[PDB]
Amino acid sequence: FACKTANGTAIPIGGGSANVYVNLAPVVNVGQNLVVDLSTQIFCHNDYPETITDYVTLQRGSAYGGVLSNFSGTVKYSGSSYPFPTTSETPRVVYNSRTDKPWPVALYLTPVSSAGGVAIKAGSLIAVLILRQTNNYNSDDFQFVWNIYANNDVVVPTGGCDVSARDVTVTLPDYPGSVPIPLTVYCAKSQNLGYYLSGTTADAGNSIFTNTASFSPAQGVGVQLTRNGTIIPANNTVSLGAVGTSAVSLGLTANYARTGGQVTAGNVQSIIGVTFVYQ
């Protein structure tokens, strides 16, 4: 029983170890699968098929470098899947031919939301796979160790941030009242954010959002947003700085402002757009 690498290298009868060099998808997104198919690069064969039956097993599977810190994954061995890094010696597959058959092993790796840019360095030890071979002939128990190196960087693009917002705020604090506006943002990967408001305005300072509502339009008012006392006029980019894993409150408050002159009873409703700009 011996195995060889599609690249060239072999591990002879009795076991030993070899390097397996793999080119991986250059880009993988959070949520997706990075697939390292070794069945395309590692082959074995039985040396005496007619009288001996060989049993190949995935003894152990271990992760290194980026694979270890940026991914969660499974190992598909001969049709079935298991947790990778592995936790138990896999079931045994049989080899019965002098003809080089593949070793059906594939790594299915999915980047974590926290995965940087370069989740796997070019030239790094990505994994070590231990092939254990026995037989129905004697006490032969040999190990074929495969050291999997990545030939290139596998980048995981940075995603957009999440704008955690409760919902349709009831700016009910009757005409003079003002409420705080719960709105925070967090990013799986720290990055600079900025935002600006947008919508129909009712003033020359362009910062009092027009009253939009049917039920007897409480005329003369309008909604104005403030951030810790500072007024936010439409299309004025407010720089949030670096936003990371800890949510950042924009510190918004809805305020009533007067547009025209005579204020009048009725409802006051409004829709404002908040646009987060990514660097």
Partner: protein
């Protein structure tokens, strides 16, 4: 909580279409996704079209936005052209707060979209380095001769930390030089993957 799967998009000149991911976190609350692309000046020309132009995302879901090139190669072919991708999340009217004074917000994600003429020499990886300077006692002028938009971030007059800059292709930008200077100009940039390139040293031209 609706989020885009990228903080930017590279549109390869020629591609029939590029796609972007959108995912809605809020386990319960539908949204109307309305997307569009404005040009550098902020005007909605039809250079690029997104589909579906309007659709719903109910609860935790994931869908794909596809950006279509409408610009019949009527853009400069020696450099990238700057555009802005916008994805708006439209909530729904509560028939519950109907006779109440209410305020509704519509979150929008706006990211850069570069039209990259697929036929340029200098490979993107090899662009940040080409960044030279010109530092006075108040007017440091980032200078980019390549054909890519340089998103200069973490800039420093050696010790002093400055304000980020976006340096246009074969163009330049001047960031207010504080004078708490040095010349040990330092900066990193943001690559096609919205990833920080490695810190490099300012090299005044």
């Amino acid at each position: 909580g609706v989020a885009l799967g990228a903080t930017r998009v590279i549109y390869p000149a020629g591609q029939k279409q590029v796609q972007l991911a959108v995912t809605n976190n809020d386990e319960n609350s539908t949204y109307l996704i309305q997307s569009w692309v404005e040009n550098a000046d902020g005007v909605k020309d039809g250079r690029f079209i997104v589909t579906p132009p309007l659709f719903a995302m109910k609860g935790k879901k994931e869908n794909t936005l596809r950006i279509l090139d409408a610009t019949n190669n009527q853009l400069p072919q020696d450099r990238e052209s700057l555009f802005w991708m916008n994805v708006k999340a439209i909530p729904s009217m509560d028939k519950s707060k109907l006779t109440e004074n209410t305020l509704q917000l519509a979150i929008i994600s706006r990211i850069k979209l570069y039209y990259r003429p697929a036929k340029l020499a200098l490979p993107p990886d090899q662009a940040a380095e080409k960044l030279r300077f010109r530092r006075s006692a108040n007017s440091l002028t980032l200078i980019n001769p390549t054909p890519y938009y340089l998103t200069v971030t973490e800039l420093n007059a050696g010790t002093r930390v400055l304000e980020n800059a976006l340096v246009p292709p074969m163009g330049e930008s001047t960031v207010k030089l504080p004078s708490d200077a040095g010349s040990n100009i330092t900066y990193r940039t943001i690559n096609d993957y919205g990833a920080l390139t490695p810190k490099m040293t300012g090299v005044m031209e």
